[PDB]
Amino acid sequence: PFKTSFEKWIESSLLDPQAKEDKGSTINLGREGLKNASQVKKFLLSPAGKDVIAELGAQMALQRNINLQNQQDRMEHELFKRRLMAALFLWYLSKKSHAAEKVKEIIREYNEKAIKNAEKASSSTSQADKEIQKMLDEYEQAIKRAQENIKKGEELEKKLDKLERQGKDLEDKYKTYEENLEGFEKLLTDSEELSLSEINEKMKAFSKDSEKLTQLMEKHKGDEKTVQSLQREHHDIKAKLANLQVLHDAHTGKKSYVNEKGNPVSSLKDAHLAINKDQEVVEHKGQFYLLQKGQWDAIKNDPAALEKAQKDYSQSKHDLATIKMEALIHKLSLEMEKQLETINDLIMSTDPKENEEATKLLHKHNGLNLKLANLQDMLAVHRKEKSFFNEKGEKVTSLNDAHYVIGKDQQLFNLGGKFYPIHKEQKILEKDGKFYLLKQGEDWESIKDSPEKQKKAEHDFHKLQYETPMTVKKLVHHNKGLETTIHKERIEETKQQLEDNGKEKIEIANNISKLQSTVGVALNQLNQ
């Protein structure tokens, strides 16, 4: 996992199984009982208001401390600890070439002073205790500043590593999304088409749904509004089954794909109509007619039959486009369900390695969801259920010129210079800073005495934000802009704080450097 600079320094320089003592660049604090990097770190972050005698594992600490039998031993030991802490911080902060031997000298000096203490014990010490106390008090502010700096430093570095990973995941998220925003025409050329087996599988599933709805209509018998809604869904399925049946028929030869001219084509992608064997297409003076095979002479002088054959041709072309779009929807839905089963498995795994695989699969899956949503929009506009509008709210013909897509009974209401997707029957009222979605004809006078109507109207207005009627491509583009802008602000702040943190090290190291030289001299004079 992620290591901070401070942690990397501890492992590389302070806990080195290789030594030298001679002019080295590393030390091994395992020789002072410090076992691991976390323990070394804890030692370096020792609190100010208590002696440092609990920096080792508890058993080892008590083992070592039994030797600190008096005031002198305790005072000299604490001076050793603070002096050692200071040298190591100076090492990390300033990275001077001879920092390792500085540390070795401090350890060496303490040890032999402890030896000389014992030799003489084989007499007055109170003033030396007080002199050491002044040095500890002088170490207090200097070390604490270094500790605070390193703690802020580590926090910032971990924050930046987190942000950096998010930024990379952010870029890949939108790169995946954008690969899913092609138009209908292009989705076709790279459509791996819905196979006969998949067509049979969809027709079978829709048949099960239909029977379930039929049974439900029997349960809810008499409840007309429930039944009417159920009939609506059953009718919708019946139309989709009819569309799949055309594809089925074209595969079996019961129907045939033809181009604009009525000439046979092999692929659905080249088809403009799917016709029966008793039908044919005639082009006449630039106009196209779909008629009963062989009946041209019987209709060519009959304007009514000519109009009907022309209507039938246009309807047939229109229906096949509807069939193609639903077929792509079915195929993409199949692929999505397949992807989701893989994802759901991984996200629920008790193994985090599998949990992390799901991340990139989610982007692909969500991207697929967006391709599907776009296609549903294209199909709705195709079937005249919805229309496209540009940025100024003008109705446009092409998805490429569109910014919005809304239902035929919807409008783009212009309020604050902002467009709201509401019913043609509705409007928005502004009163005292508040906003109410109401019917036309309604006004403040009609709701001013009704808290529940005001609450509901205001509630209905704020729910509109979840119904952003932009095209999928516009949705992705604007969301990319927001997430990217906000992400960069966070990166900029963290990086800047990190810069501040680095710059503060200089005065902190200087304050320590001055102390170390002073203490070393004052230690020499208390002696050996």
Q: What are the residues facing 273 on neighbouring strands?
A: 258
Q: How far is CA 265 from CA 209, 251, 330, 442, 522, in A?
A: 34, 12, 23, 58, 100
Rounded-to-integer distance, Cα 111 and Cα 117, Å = 10
First to last CA, the chain: 45
CB 420 within 8 A of CB 412: yes
φ, ψ (nearest 5 deg) of residue 519:
-60, -45
User: Do 290 and 177 have their domain in common?
Assistant: no
Question: Which one of 324, 357, 384 terminates a domain?
Answer: 384
User: Do 391 and 380 have their domain in common?
Assistant: no
Radius of gyration of the chain, Cα coordinates, nearest whole angstrom:
40
- Cα 317–Cα 368–Cα 470 angle in degrees, nearest 5: 75
Q: How far is CA 306 from CA 284, 286, 295, 309, in A?
A: 11, 14, 11, 5
User: Do 20 and 126 have their domain in common?
Assistant: yes
Rounded-to-integer distance, Cα 108 and Cα 102, Å = 10
φ, ψ (nearest 5 deg) of residue 194:
-70, 115
Torsion of CA 241, 244, 245, 247, to 10 degrees: 170
Spell out the alpha helix ranges (H) of 95-195.
99-121, 126-178, 184-189
Q: How many domains does the chain have?
A: 2
Nearest-CA neighbor of 362 among 174, 179, 173?
173
Q: How far is CA 129 from CA 82, 367, 526, in A?
A: 15, 72, 10
For the record, the structure tokens of 498 come out as: 């990190």
Nearest-CA neighbor of 470 among 487, 482, 486?
482
307: domain CATH number?
A: 6.10.140.2010
Rounded-to-integer distance, Cα 477 and Cα 495, Å = 27
Question: Which one of 349, 367, 384 terminates a domain?
Answer: 384
Task: Using DSSP, state whether 86 is helix, strand or coil.
Answer: helix
Nearest-CA neighbor of 154 among 143, 144, 146?
146
Q: How many CB atoms lie within 10 A of CB 17?
A: 7
Q: How many CB atoms lie within 10 A of CB 375?
A: 20
CB 167 within 8 A of CB 491: yes
User: Do 199 and 254 have their domain in common?
Assistant: yes
User: Do 12 and 94 have their domain in common?
Assistant: yes
Resolution of the coordinates, Å: 2.1
Q: What are the residues facing 431 on neighbouring strands?
A: 434
User: Do 60 and 192 have their domain in common?
Assistant: no
CB 484 within 8 A of CB 170: yes
For the record, the structure tokens of 12 come out as: 């590389």
| Helix or strand holding residue 303 (H, E) | helix 303-347
Residues 6+ apart with CB under 8 A from 53: 61, 64, 65, 68, 77, 78
Nearest-CA neighbor of 394 among 376, 420, 412?
412
User: Do 441 and 491 have their domain in common?
Assistant: yes
User: Do 368 and 466 have their domain in common?
Assistant: no
User: Do 358 and 322 have their domain in common?
Assistant: yes
Query: What does 403-440 look like in DSSP terms, one character per residue?
Result: SEEEETTEEEEESSSSEEEEETTEEEEEETTEEEEEET
Torsion of CA 503, 506, 508, 511, to 10 degrees: -160
Residues 6+ apart with CB under 8 A from 379: 322, 325, 326, 329
Nearest-CA neighbor of 29 among 42, 422, 398?
42
Domain span at residue 140? 1-184+385-528
- Which letter, b or e, does each residue of 103-134 get, where b requires 16 or more Cβ atoms within 10 Å of its Cβ? bbebbebbeebbeeeeeeeeeeeeeeeeebee
Rounded-to-integer distance, Cα 151 and Cα 160, Å = 14
Rounded-to-integer distance, Cα 69 and Cα 294, Å = 120
For the record, the structure tokens of 215 come out as: 């049974």
CB 422 within 8 A of CB 437: yes
User: Do 373 and 389 have their domain in common?
Assistant: no
Q: What are the DSSP E strand ranges found in 242-372?
A: 255-258, 273-276, 279-284, 287-292
Torsion of CA 504, 507, 511, 514, to 10 degrees: 140
Q: Residue 230 half-sphere exposure, CB side, CA atoms within 13 Å?
A: 19
Rounded-to-integer distance, Cα 256 and Cα 471, Å = 35
User: Do 201 and 178 have their domain in common?
Assistant: no
Torsion of CA 114, 118, 120, 121, to 10 degrees: 140
Rounded-to-integer distance, Cα 299 and Cα 296, Å = 5
Nearest-CA neighbor of 372 among 325, 424, 429?
325
User: Do 360 and 405 have their domain in common?
Assistant: no
Question: Which one of 335, 351, 384 terminates a domain?
Answer: 384
CB 503 within 8 A of CB 153: no
Elucidated via: X-ray
Rounded-to-integer distance, Cα 84 and Cα 31, Å = 14
CA dihedral over 283, 285, 291, 293, signed as positive or negative: negative
Torsion of CA 33, 35, 37, 43, to 10 degrees: -40
Backbone torsion region of residue 433, taken as left when φ is above 0, otherwise alpha when ψ lies between -120 and 50, otherwise beta: left
Q: How far is CA 275 from CA 189, 306, 315, in A?
A: 22, 18, 12
8-state DSSP, 464: G
